[PDB]
Amino acid sequence: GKSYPTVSADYQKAVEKAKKKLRGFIAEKRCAPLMLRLAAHSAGTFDKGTKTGGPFGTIKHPAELAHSANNGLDIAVRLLEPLKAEFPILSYADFYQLAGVVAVEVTGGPEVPFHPGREDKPEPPPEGRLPDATKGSDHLRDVFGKAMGLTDQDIVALSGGHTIGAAHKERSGFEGPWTSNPLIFDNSYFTELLSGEKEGLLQLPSDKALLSDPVFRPLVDKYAADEDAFFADYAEAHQKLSELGFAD
Amino acid sequence: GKSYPTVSADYQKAVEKAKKKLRGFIAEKRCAPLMLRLAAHSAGTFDKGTKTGGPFGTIKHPAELAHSANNGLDIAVRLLEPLKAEFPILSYADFYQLAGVVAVEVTGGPEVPFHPGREDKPEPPPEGRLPDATKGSDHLRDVFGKAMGLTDQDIVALSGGHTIGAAHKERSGFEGPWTSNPLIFDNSYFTELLSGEKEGLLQLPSDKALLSDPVFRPLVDKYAADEDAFFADYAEAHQKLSELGFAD
Ligand code: HEM
Ligand code: HEM
Ligand code: NA
Ligand code: NA
Ligand code: NA
Ligand code: NA
């Protein structure tokens, strides 16, 4: 359903150069998971019914960063400012989504297709649209389905983003990594979900909800058994997420 | 002059998966410069006149690792063994060259084209073919030109590989990084060469030789002024290096 806008040759040149610089920066700084979280929280405010929110640069606003669910994302925005300044032609919206795509790539994940042209919008969406870690499948469908317009498959695949990174007791309150290799993008999130609670690894109530839902569970099983299938569905879902409200 | 061999679909699938896994591993382990050094020392033993040496997996042999110029590369080989074992179909030769290509990519450098099909050869080349850091332009031409068959342009561009990493007093004896950002691949090696010896940054006699040679100096100037030109020439040179003796 996408009709991507035209951007100038200079814009495309900046996208390509920024992608390279983001690889080096994100790898060196060890901030891939934080950048993926930034991209997801930027995009995840989209409401399809009103066509409000989504990946339009508003997460840079102190007002949006102050949202409870966005604790710690001010670090991500600050980390990217010097590099963003080297690419003044790029929108913040494109830059943050490119950082999310790069975060997945540098940690060994699939290559998520990227299309430039998001415009920075003036007003942050209302607070409270982002997923709630303490709730289950009904709420996941409310957020990803009813608001964002993504599928049940997308929900499970995107939950696999937790294969990189960790929670922090000072941010959400939850604490620790989902996987034994929090800078490696693979299907281990699903493997860990299936094996039960191993010592030192995190499972949110929202992660656990995937195991007991009739639609989500077969997907968990599939991804645990078949990393290639996970990578394919993940790339599809991440692309859709990164493009909510954009190019239709 | 290259006619690349055919490899099976399964081989190509392993190349693509290994490339991803190498990105994640190399980024996490912070070993990009060591892996680039490994790939360069593997390839740099090629002698065009005899068609001996080159990137054919022999650097994995304890006998080749024992070469003075290869101090510390046993670490690189060890680091890669677990991942290599996940891709039994791949030659070590291809795996090490792919690691070098990935090292450049993850640090923000150009995308160096990669072609599979190098076969692992039984016998390491004689010791003493690798570049000597204490010598100058004549010796650089002996090694890169007379032996490897690379151009003067290739010599200067490849010297820019020192934009990542550092020397170690326990390995070569030289000590410290060439650049202020040793995990970032950019044209800073050349910028530093031109500005003089800044505190805490390394310049080998072989680096300094580039500044006073009539052919090498204009290239240093070009790369210092134009990072895009450096990236283009670097990608060309690295590809050629990685393919010495291979596919003609
Ligand atoms: C499915 C609903 C989701 C819930 C309930 C959820 C919740 C959370 C929570 C509570 C944290 C911990 C924040 C902290 O304390 O630092 C977190 C972190 C993270 N989230 Fe999710 N999230 C969801 C979806 C996503 C999606 C769609 C992505 C991207 C594909 C994503 C990527 C990440 C990453 C990479 C981290 C680690 C951040 C770091 O290491 O600093 N999450 N998420
Ligand atoms: C031009 C002739 C060259 C000379 C004289 C030379 C010499 C050296 C020396 C003495 C070291 C330090 C080893 C140590 O003590 O750890 C080193 C490291 C390194 N070399 Fe070169 N080299 C040359 C060419 C190359 C090429 C062609 C490449 C790849 C394009 C390369 C990539 C590297 C890298 C990335 C390191 C850092 C390794 C680390 O951080 O552990 N070098 N080189
Ligand atoms: Na955004
Ligand atoms: Na992981
Ligand atoms: Na090799
Ligand atoms: Na550097």
* DSSP states of chain B: ---PPP--HHHHHHHHHHHHHHHHHHHHHT-HHHHHHHHHHHHTT-BTTTTB-SSSSGGGSHHHHTSGGGTTHHHHHHHHHHHHTT-TTS-HHHHHHHHHHHHHHHTT---------PPPPSSPPPS--S--TT--HHHHIIIIIIIT---HHHHHHHHGGGGS-EE-TTTTS--EESSS-TT--STHHHHHHHH---TT----HHHHHHHHSTTHHHHHHHHHH-HHHHHHHHHHHHHHHHTTTS--
Q: What would the DSSP string read from start to end of A22-86?
A: HHHHHHHHT-HHHHHHHHHHHHTT-BTTTTB-SSSSGGGSHHHHTSGGGTTHHHHHHHHHHHHTT
State both tokens at B170.
């326990």
Judge: A25–B184 Cβ closer than 8 Å, yes or no: yes
Total residue count of chain A as it appears in this document: 248
State both tokens at A1.
């359903």
Amino acid symbol at A174 = F
Cβ-contact B106, B183 below 8 angstroms: no
Answer yes or no: do A110 and A226 share one domain: no
Answer yes or no: do B11 and B124 share one domain: yes
Experimental method of this PDB entry:
X-ray
- For the beta carbon of residue A248, count every other beta carbon within 10 angstroms: 8
- Distance in Å from the first CA to the final CA of chain B: 7
* Chain A residues touching residue B183 (CB < 8 angstroms): 24, 27-28
State both tokens at A66.
């102050």
Amino acid symbol at B131 = P
- Separation of CA A162 and ligand 1 centre (Å): 6
Which of A182, A165, A168, A43 has its CA nearest to residue A114?
A43
Alpha carbon distance A127, A130 (integer Å): 8
Q: How far, rounded to the nearest angstrom, does the alpha carbon of residue B166 sit from its chain's CA centroid?
A: 14
* Residue A176 DSSP class: E
Answer yes or no: do A15 and A126 share one domain: yes
State both tokens at B147.
């032996």
Alpha carbon distance A240, A111 (integer Å): 13
Expressed in Å, this structure's resolution amounts to 1.3
Which residues form the pocket of ligand 2, taking CB atoms under 6 Å from any ligand atom? B 33-34, 36-37, 40, 72, 131, 133, 140, 158-159, 161-162, 164-168, 171-172, 174, 204, 206
Q: Which domain holds residue A136?
A: 131-237
Amino acid symbol at B27 = A
By three-state DSSP, how is residue A177 classified?
strand
* Residue A87 DSSP class: -
Which residues does B234 contact at the CB level (< 8 Å), separation at least 6?
B104, B109, B110, B157, B158, B160, B161
Looking only at the bridges linking them, the beta strands covering A166-167 and B176-177 are: unpaired
Answer yes or no: do A111 and A14 share one domain: yes
Alpha carbon distance A165, A104 (integer Å): 11
Interface-testing mutation among A16, A107, A163, A227, with chain B (most B C-beta atoms within 10 A): A107
Which of B63, B30, B23, B31 has its CA nearest to residue B45?
B63
Cβ-contact A7, A16 below 8 angstroms: no
- Separation of CA B172 and ligand 2 centre (Å): 9
Amino acid symbol at B209 = A
Alpha helices in A86-171 (DSSP H): 92-106, 137-140, 152-159
C-alpha distances out from residue B154 to A190, B114, B118, B186, B202, Å: 46, 17, 22, 16, 21
- For the beta carbon of residue B240, count every other beta carbon within 10 angstroms: 20
* Chain A residues touching residue B184 (CB < 8 angstroms): 24-25, 28
Q: What would the DSSP string read from start to end of B82-136?
A: HHHTT-TTS-HHHHHHHHHHHHHHHTT---------PPPPSSPPPS--S--TT--
Number of independent structural domains in chain A = 2
Alpha carbon distance B103, B222 (integer Å): 24
Best residue for ligand 1 mutational test, from A34, A162, A234 (most atoms within 8 Å of Cβ): A162
Which residues does B237 contact at the CB level (< 8 Å), separation at least 6?
B150, B153, B154, B157, B158
Q: Whose CA is nearest to atom 29 of ligand 2?
A: B161
Answer yes or no: do A109 and A66 share one domain: yes
CA angle A149, A155, A160 (to 5 degrees): 145
State both tokens at A35.
């950048």
* Chain B residues touching residue A32 (CB < 8 angstroms): 27
Which of A7, A26, A122 has its CA nearest to residue A83?
A26
State both tokens at B16.
């693509």
* Residue A118 DSSP class: P
Q: Whose CA is nearest to atom 25 of ligand 2?
A: B159
Cβ-contact B56, B119 below 8 angstroms: yes
Judge: B27–A183 Cβ closer than 8 Å, yes or no: yes
Alpha carbon distance B113, B16 (integer Å): 13
State both tokens at A208.
């656990």
Residue holding tokens 């300044």?
A85
- The minimal CB distance from A184 to the residues B24, B110, B184 is found for B24
Residues paired with residue B166 on neighbouring β-strands, in sequence order: B177
Judge: B183–A109 Cβ closer than 8 Å, yes or no: no
CATH number at B189 reads 1.10.420.10
Q: Which residues of A are catalytic?
A: 41
Alpha carbon distance B99, B25 (integer Å): 10
* Chain B residues touching residue A23 (CB < 8 angstroms): 105-108
State both tokens at A111.
């290559």
Answer yes or no: do A209 and A244 share one domain: no
Answer yes or no: do B18 and B135 share one domain: no
Q: Whose CA is nearest to atom 34 of ligand 1?
A: A37
Cβ-contact B106, B30 below 8 angstroms: no
User: Ligand 2 atom closest to Cα of B133?
Assistant: 5
* Chain A residues touching residue B23 (CB < 8 angstroms): 105-108
- For the beta carbon of residue A246, count every other beta carbon within 10 angstroms: 21
Residue B43 half-sphere exposure toward CB, CA atoms < 13 A: 30
- The minimal CB distance from A21 to the residues B28, B106, B108 is found for B108
- Exposure string of B92-127, with b = 16+ CB inside 10 Å and e = fewer, is bbbbbbbbbbbbbbbbbbbebebbbbbeebeebbee
State both tokens at A122.
């003036």
Answer yes or no: do A233 and A190 share one domain: yes
Which residues form the pocket of ligand 1, taking CB atoms under 6 Å from any ligand atom? A 33-34, 36-37, 40, 72, 131, 133, 140, 158-159, 161-162, 164-168, 171-172, 174, 204, 206
Answer yes or no: do B101 and B171 share one domain: no
Answer yes or no: do B136 and B67 share one domain: no
Which of B230, B238, B231, B248 has its CA nearest to residue B100?
B238
Answer yes or no: do A78 and A68 share one domain: yes
Looking only at the bridges linking them, the beta strands covering A176-177 and A166-167 are: antiparallel
* Residue A6 DSSP class: P
Cβ-contact B127, B70 below 8 angstroms: no
Closest alpha carbon within chain B to A110: B20
- Exposure string of A169-198, with b = 16+ CB inside 10 Å and e = fewer, is eebeeeeebbbebbbbbbbbbbbbbeeeee
Judge: A108–B184 Cβ closer than 8 Å, yes or no: no
Which residues does B126 contact at the CB level (< 8 Å), separation at least 6?
B52
- The minimal CB distance from B183 to the residues A27, A105, A181 is found for A27
Alpha carbon distance A203, A211 (integer Å): 11
Answer yes or no: do B80 and B174 share one domain: no
Alpha carbon distance A101, A39 (integer Å): 8
Alpha carbon distance B184, B167 (integer Å): 16
CATH number at A28 reads 1.10.520.10
